[PDB]
């Protein structure tokens with residue numbers, strides 16, 4: 442398999458859980474981490490690293506890459522581990538910032554049941570991902586691609602879409618090598 | 633920054649692309665005129681594609697893993713395909729009958745149909761030529777959002793691509809955006 446459980450013991454586990462809890466906000470008191478698995482996908486990772494170096498070479502602005510969260514359903518977990526994030530596996534209910542795959546800066550958003558619904562055991566799946574957001578532009582409802590840059594720009598479209606230029610909290614990506622799942626956090630609601 | 637480079641007619645590359653096009657145009661051979669052929673260049677996508685190709689060649693015992701195929705499209709999707717490759721998101725929607733992916737034709741007679749490459753205001757029709765990593769394929773069906781399941785007797789869960797029929801496949805559906813590399817764009821027209 443492509444998932445490897447990490448020991449609570451480790452620096453990796455602790456930094457991943459630290460960042461998760463540090464952005465749970467309101468939800469922090471009622472969410473418990475069950476386990477954290479490292480995700481491995483050698484091909485996708487190498488494809489991502491190529492996309493990353495190209496963006497670093499092209500983009501004058503920094504950062505080009507962000508750590509973001511993605512809540513999903515139990516059934517989608519194996520597909521995302523095998524094939525990365527794309528529309529066909531990920532939730533296709535959100536259209537307000539475009540018809541792509543949605544990622545959150547803060548876990549408080551991804552831990553909501555509408556995005557990471559519990560399975561039979563009450564377990565919820567939240568991926569942590571390295572995402573090449575690059576140059577993002579304001580998302581538009583129903584758009585199938587990232588928004589157009591317009592005339593002050595040699596490129597046709599932004600690299601990603603976002604909810605708002607003021608404290609962006611949601612990013613929409615439209616290419617399947619633009620986000621590399623690094624970890625899967627299984628968590629649960631606890632009073 | 634330019635993705636597209638017009639080829640001169642009196643070059644080996646132009647002539648080779650056009651011969652392959654006419655060779656599978658079938659009954660349309662008589663009625664389709666090539667206006668322009670352009671080379672598509674997308675260095676990042678090509679490298680990502682070459683990595684996928686290498687992995688598939690290592691994993692697969694059968695051959696060929698890669699095929700030259702055709703993709704008809706609408707005028708407005710052309711700049712997105714050159715800049716971003718083939719997607720449901722950057723392409724124009726494709727068909728749905730063998731799954732919700734990107735559709736490629738073995739024969740240019742299929743892609744040249746107006747339903748897939750509708751003429752623009754000037755009567756010009758756009759057909760990409762692509763290298764496509766079809767790998768192991770299985771029968772596609774409606775509503776599939778990945779290649780079909782391989783079923784019992786296979787180590788892998790799914791095929792690499794879907795096709796119309798396992799005997800003499802003529803259509804392939806791919807579901808990953810690094811699985812197809814546009815190499816050329818043929819602009820053609822109906823002649824009366």
Ligand SMILES: NC(=O)c1cccc(N)c1
Pocket residue numbers: 510511512513532535543544545550551552556611612
């Ligand atoms: N699936 C998710 O974690 C998510 C992230 C941001 C926005 C939405 N709608 C969903």
Ligand SMILES: NC(=O)c1cccc(N)c1
Pocket residue numbers: 702703704705726727735736737742743744748803
């Ligand atoms: N867009 C295309 O050229 C094409 C080829 C085969 C089948 C379909 N549906 C489309």
Ligand code: NA
Pocket residue numbers: 590591592593594595596597598
């Ligand atoms: Na522009």
Ligand code: NA
Pocket residue numbers: 782783784785786787788789790
């Ligand atoms: Na199987």
